[model samples]
Target chain A: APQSITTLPLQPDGENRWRLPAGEYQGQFTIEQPMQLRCEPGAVIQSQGQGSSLLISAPDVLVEGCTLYEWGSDLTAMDSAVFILPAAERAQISNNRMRGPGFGVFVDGTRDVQVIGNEIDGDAGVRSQDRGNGIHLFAVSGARVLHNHVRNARDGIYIDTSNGNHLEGNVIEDVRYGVHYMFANENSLIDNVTRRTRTGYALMQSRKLTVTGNRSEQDQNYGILMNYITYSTITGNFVSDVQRGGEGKALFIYNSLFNTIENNHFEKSSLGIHLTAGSEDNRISGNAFVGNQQQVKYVASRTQEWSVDGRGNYWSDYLGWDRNNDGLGDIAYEPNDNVDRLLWLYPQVRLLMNSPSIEVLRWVQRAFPVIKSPGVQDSHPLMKLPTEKLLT
Target chain B: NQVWNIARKELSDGLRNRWLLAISLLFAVLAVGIAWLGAAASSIPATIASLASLATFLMPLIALLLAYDAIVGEDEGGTLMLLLTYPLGRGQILLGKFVGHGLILALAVLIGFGCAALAIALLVEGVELGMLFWAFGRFMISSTLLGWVFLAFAYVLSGKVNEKSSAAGLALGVWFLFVLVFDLVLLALLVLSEGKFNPELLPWLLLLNPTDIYRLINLSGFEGSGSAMGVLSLGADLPVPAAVLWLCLLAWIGVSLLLAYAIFRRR
Candidate 1:
């Protein structure tokens, strides 16, 4: 409820900056001129649950400092509280409050749109499947959605078929997916925090993404799910305590190839990383895997080494010692032990898990390690975890 | 009527030790400690998983200690021989003792972990009430089942072996083999399989140990504990049904009871 605005008792003033008075507008408004619509915090625009509350079709249109509420709930009609059309190039949507069942800010095919400092709350009464996204961008290029707060929507910020958007310093919670991407490439998601979502960051079918310094906490299923994402760089993310009923991967890479996942802190989940379905040739190093139940649930046709320039991640469960005091362990850090590799390759080995001969073979392997075919090995694992806070 | 008398005598003797109060108090302490530890980690699933591991290690020791000398100590004291002269069947005596000891251990677990569950319920915040209550009741039964399985194992030891000292040694040995040694062996086997093992028949392998069975049942009750504690990989498909797991725990009790009765019937 706290805002950086003081209600002025003055009337509509200024040449280009027009002040909409502190009263409720009943109908949909359109702004086609290249002007600024500045209002007090008490200035209200209620959509009466029909079409969009405000439509900006002009170039350089600025809508700021108002309580924008009660927009249409229909997602099929693409109803939104603030609808920025394709003609609204270089539009600035800032310092607004949007509360509705429809999309909070829908920028459709707009170029260089700035949707900043807006707080959006999707209706909690609506089913998540029936609700719309908080901030939805359809084919929007070079958009900057910064410092926004979104909650209780189907997804927080949905970038669909867009390119070169920069999303930073946003707080999204209690949604289906925090930030969803569909064929949206060349986007940078930085310094965002998502909590209690089903999947925090669902980057699906995209490429050339720069995801850094985000914290995904207490999410129910997946912290960062990269489905068919390629050539992306996910670095310095801090994801923790993602609890799933029977399954949850803090970071899930499915058929995602040639991405760089580095310098992240992943911990305290049901399962940590599940890199499957030909997710190959990815650079995964300088990260910390601490306290996850299963660190990596990975399988491939060949062994995958997770290291860069002789430096690897720090695993809490890694028992390798560094007697030389070089800050790296002497032996390799195998995230998947021989047992897990065998189970993934052929699951029928679990029946003799407690047999005496299996125990003898285990003892012999520990003493000898003769059949040493590696799976997921980190050759130069760090002895101590890095002290840098990913979210800081 | 004879079975009732034997059960009553066993119950009275068990009560004379003030075990319910001590065990309940111990559980209360452990519950508080576990809640504190779980709070440091924070979440209901992790807290209950800690309780599951605690019960897996602690319950079997108590059950073995209580049941190790049931037949052998009586025989050593020359009372079992006299009881045999009373025209009572060995199977009847075994069933009566099992029922009595079963109730004793059940009462101990209920009173003991019941306080723990209540304390945990009050102390831990943001827990799903339905899952919390379900886990509590399920924990109570599975813990009792685990105790009974080990008690039956102790009965077999005493019935087959004549000396109380050797029975105590064997009881401790069984506890070690099942609780401590069996876990390491399973992990070692999983590592050394070298890509070939009868995992399809492994549900039967897991069925051999009651402690592991208890672990699977109780931890999987929470659904997160099984994977977190590394008891189950959760990557492979579980070929067995949920009922079969409970039945396997029961099957061990049934088989152990039958083995104990066969050994005592040789007289």
Candidate 2:
């Protein structure tokens, strides 16, 4: 007869691999030694509904292909379905089905970890903020987080103070922050999708990272918010529907510099590319700003050059006629007006935007040269969409 | 017929004295300068704002300088009694001067701003042409209305005051109150309230001063400017409708003119 998994504690057989056959195992399991805990295709691991269901502290461990249940009631208490503690190293967690009021996986101070192909349902039916993150990585480095489906958590993936990691092919939705990281650096986020979140990617105080082939759409707050970041490459990302009435921007770069933002599609946003608060020396080119209420809102009175190497972004409001068919506008495009410049000096004048007297002022300025402004200008405005490579 | 003759005679005198040319030249220079300042910044709204400020400061002074002595000068020079013996009523003389002064003011404003407008259209680039023209038209109309209000007010002072010096003093006072003191007082009141003041009452207070009304119309009418206004623009309840403001402006002119007529006719 087949040996049942619930009969006794399973230990690593000859090959340092503990294989649990297809059966229901109750209570908790704590792995203290380095080994691989591989469950058969139909095995189930039920949690005690308190504390952590599975705590792994050993190095070079692997846990895969099991149904993890119950876990913790209060997710915010740091209780997780699978907790990889500080001393753990080279842990691989793959192909597990996680259903929890608690967090799906919490990996902290561990290195060389791979969290792959897990389907995590974070009990979204509960209060949203009360739920934990689907995948939480804190002070961990050299990790590869791949192909995880995380839904209905506080954050789909929260990486804090981590470095040199790779996050790819993840689908995260219905969360506060789709992919959130702070004080982290040298990471690559590729081919990930985030939707219906407060923020698609909220990256702060980081450097030397590559963010490509990502789609963050229909977000309430920001599609990409990079604050105090430097030396980053943001390309081939499709960001849209950054709504109004809140500080919503398709891309909000604050106090950040020396970044290359290119080949991105921004549409249906309240504002696109709001560069403010001493953010300078950034190269922004070949981007499409389409169908936004206000294309770009820069509060500073200083001029911003939006072209590099005879190339500029495509503005939908450009009315310049191109005669020679060089696919470029004949005249420069200046987005800032006198009122916008004056608003920097006297912010209270904003209340009069809809007033007829302000209308008269706009008219007078147009009718006569009344005030000079230092505003952003694009010399080589593009006539067509930069590229057809948009978010799929 | 008598009113037309008086008006014609007044126009001839103003032209002979070079008053019309001087006023038109002043408006033209200021408007053009303000327009150029705006174009340098590549911003039409800033230019308009500067022009509005110029109008508030210069328009009232010009109106008072032109009309403060209209009736008082005649009365002082013994022409009032001499003209009284003719077949003209006191109302006719006042109406005729109004028509003549109105023409001079209109011509000065139109020519001055019209040239500036032509310059802006030619020099300023990369803005919506239609919006530029429409805003300029509004500025001209509002500036003219502001001038008329003060002109009519000055007529009252000239008719009522026994001395030209008194009329001049009162005209200066009116300009100071309307242009400078009015905004200062309102700002003080708002500051004293510490943001606890009723937002509903603010628009009414703003309407009390034509200058404030002008500022509101011009500053509030542009996009992205309201956000710049910050806490000042927060209350959606505070926006006075355009029609109401126009009505208030007309009422200022009409009521002030009637008061001037009443005082002039009685004298």
Candidate 3:
């Protein structure tokens, strides 16, 4: 027989620490539904490592309205403020304050889980073996990370190898990488905000990924990073002030094949877009580049690999005309540098690749169209036509 | 009597310390300033997004800054001699000090959050009270822990190593580990763990580290819910194992105090 709801007394060991002894629940310990745990405000509970803050391997679990703190001093161990280990079908974790541990709240092996309205801050506990992470969903499909606040950790909101997942209306910030999705396909990241991060959105080894209606700003590197991802669409994103600090490059695509970048905003970045080795067949059109030191940068071999469109993108620095009224530019725009072209002659040119002088030369070539790679024009630039009107 | 004296002295000294006060004020200014700017430039929802970002990057930094000198500053100034001479148990003194610092921290957070929340309510079209409270609460706990953990660390460091330079270096180094180096290490760890070990161990590994957990909780996305990353990368639910979480925190406080106590015993 499972205990319906267990209430244990808290023992204050010191000025801050509190202990909640261990117990298991056979039935769901519920806050709203059949099995849930609920609390009033000003409720602060600390752990002593005897058991988790709220452990549920059962079906239909809910925990709400309490602040749960750490138990052990070593954060580099397997522990959480809330743990859901098994494959529970209908679980809801909502409206609680959870902090510390290696990971804060988790939904692994669960389907049809809705995590809503919880405040999770995973730092301020003990030092762990691994760096603390806020909330994680492992190997679980169709789980939603909705309306949670996360901060200050290694990586925030990583979607690893989970298919058909929806990350809608999430606000993630102030970490190394804001949204990291790898080996995950058919995922939709919509109406999300990733700001003040080292890297904004990282998609690696994923296919059929759609990132729309999202804003990534104040990044040290690329607002959107892609590696080994194919058939992905990065649209309607407002990317700004992506200053490269340590190996930082905006829109970094390496070893990625056949993707689309359209109608996005790139502002105030040192380098707006970068395509390195093993990247190919990327259709880039109708993007706005504003106030970047260099609009586009390429390190790919032109003939062999990593070739992006040299035209079609609306450059803020493009002072050319559409005199023909055909919506096609009268002159060509060469975004890549001399070093970028020299990668064809000497592949070693990729090493000393980034220079301001090369940027100036690229700009000069944009004005003097015939001097750059011949016929590098937006053969069909959309002059006055509005691009695709994305639905939120 | 000793505990009371310590609490009063600590509170007074904390208020008087320009560096500490400046740190808290800076947090307040940054919180309100960034949110307002984001609201003006972007949407109100984006302002919360920006707030989450700033909290993750700045909260721990502030926590470390305010409390890095909690115990070591007294030791360096030889004020511990006077404090130690007071008529109370060392634990009482420690408890009093902790309470005083916590009160100050809580006050700062309240003010900072109050300003930000008011700004959101006034400026944002559809103001969300629950979201604001939720985000603020999460940030406060993590930041407060940062204060407590570092203070305990400062205590241990002050006792073990007598030099101010070394203690400062250690504190800064640890801060760097949490803020910067840990991310790089996590990246490397992930790459190494590809296909070799079970992904279930990944959350287990990440759960072991407070830095990883702290980063994730700040997001308004994964508050009550877990992330999809753990499930996708590793075929596990990213189990939080809350039992272990509290244990690690208490253990840290205990060990640090024990170290401080041992050092004081020698003196």
Candidate 3 residues B1-267, lDDT tens each?
666667787677677878767877877897777666656653343344345445445555555555556556667788777877866666776667776766676676667766877776777677567876776676666555544655566566565666677777877877777555665565456444422355345555555445445444443254321111212222133565544554554565577667766775674
lDDT of 2 at A389: 65
- DockQ for candidate 2, please give it: 0.08
Scanning candidate 1 chain B in windows of ten residues, the lowest lDDT window is: B225-234
What is the TM-score (0 to 1) of candidate 2? 0.61
Candidate 1 chain A least-lDDT 10 residues: A1-10
TM-score of chain B of each: 0.89, 0.89, 0.77
TM-scores of the models, in the given order? 0.58, 0.61, 0.49
Comparing candidate 1 with candidate 3, which one achieves the higher DockQ? 1
Instruction: Quote the positional error of residue A180 for candidate 3 in Å.
Output: 1.7
By lDDT: ranked, best first: 1, 2, 3
Pitting candidate 1 against candidate 3, the one with the higher TM-score is: 1
Judge the docking of candidate 3 as incorrect, acceptable, medium or high.
Answer: incorrect
Q: Write the per-residue lDDT of candidate 1 for residues A210-294, one digit (tens) a residue.
A: 9999999899888898988888999889999899843888998888988898989998987888888588778999888888988
The candidate scoring highest on lDDT is: 1
Which lDDT values do the candidates have, in the order given?
A: 0.78, 0.77, 0.60
DockQ of each: 0.01, 0.08, 0.01
Judging by TM-score against the true structure, name the best candidate. 2
DockQ of 1: 0.01
